[PDB]
């Protein structure tokens, strides 16, 4: 399992945001367009209470991500999975997650990097490749932005 | 553009291998186990003449290629590709390759880390990844070499 960052300060996630890389632990995840967890993140929408909510293309997809004792951790049930972790942060260009199932983390493991704008970003790559170094990944799929959006 | 080895020792790339990692420029290319570069190498069959015969599964597939002035690059009429490459090999552990349509590799480029036994070799998978890095890829999959087999 992936570390969640230290100090997230979710309400600077807000906005919109581009799928920019995508990789999961089995291949089915992610091997199609309409493969489960095939999804492009199109905006993060933090609410009062410390809970996120994640709007999402497929078709639109509304994810509510409710808070843990780790203010990085949150609880979902959607997508075959029930936990996402932000993994890293600046808040104004990339941001890193992953989504698990917490009993089956093998057979469910999936991670992005999003992007702020629809461009290329070599370095949030960069990061997103350290982050998955040591998770157990068969799929990596990298996005033009402009496509989906 | 890969550049291919120099002084490859063709005949020793005889006999067995397994596909543990193929990676490509174009996510369809490689997306569904019926892309049409999900193709998995089982045999190398060099033949007297300096030519390159490949047996692949995906449903049984044969390919030759066939030599040029340069001993690391093949040509080849299948799978929409013309040319096959040699990126590296020690022969007795490792190889990797790629295919590409010499005439638009940015829809075709399609490259492979063969490995000799059905185990997953993480440094065949480093030096794919390295040889992959300047690359234009946007897909890239692990196996465990067991399951095709």
């Not at 049930?77 to 199932?101: I, P």
């Amino acid at each position: 399992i992936p570390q969640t960052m230290q100090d997230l300060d979710l309400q600077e996630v807000a906005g919109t945001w581009y799928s920019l890389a995508m990789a999961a632990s089995d291949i089915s995840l992610l091997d199609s367009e309409s493969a489960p967890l095939r999804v492009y993140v199109e905006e993060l929408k933090p609410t009062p209470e410390g809970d996120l909510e994640i709007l999402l293309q497929k078709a639109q997809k509304k994810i509510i991500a409710e808070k843990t004792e780790s203010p990085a951790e949150f609880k979902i049930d959607a997508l075959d999975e029930n936990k996402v972790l932000v993994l890293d942060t600046d808040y104004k260009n990339y941001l890193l997650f992953c989504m698990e199932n917490a009993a089956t983390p093998g057979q469910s493991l999936a991670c992005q990097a999003l992007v702020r704008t629809q461009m290329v970003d070599d370095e949030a790559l960069e990061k997103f490749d350290k982050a998955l170094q040591p998770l157990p990944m068969h799929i990596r799929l990298s996005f033009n932005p402009t496509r989906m959006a």
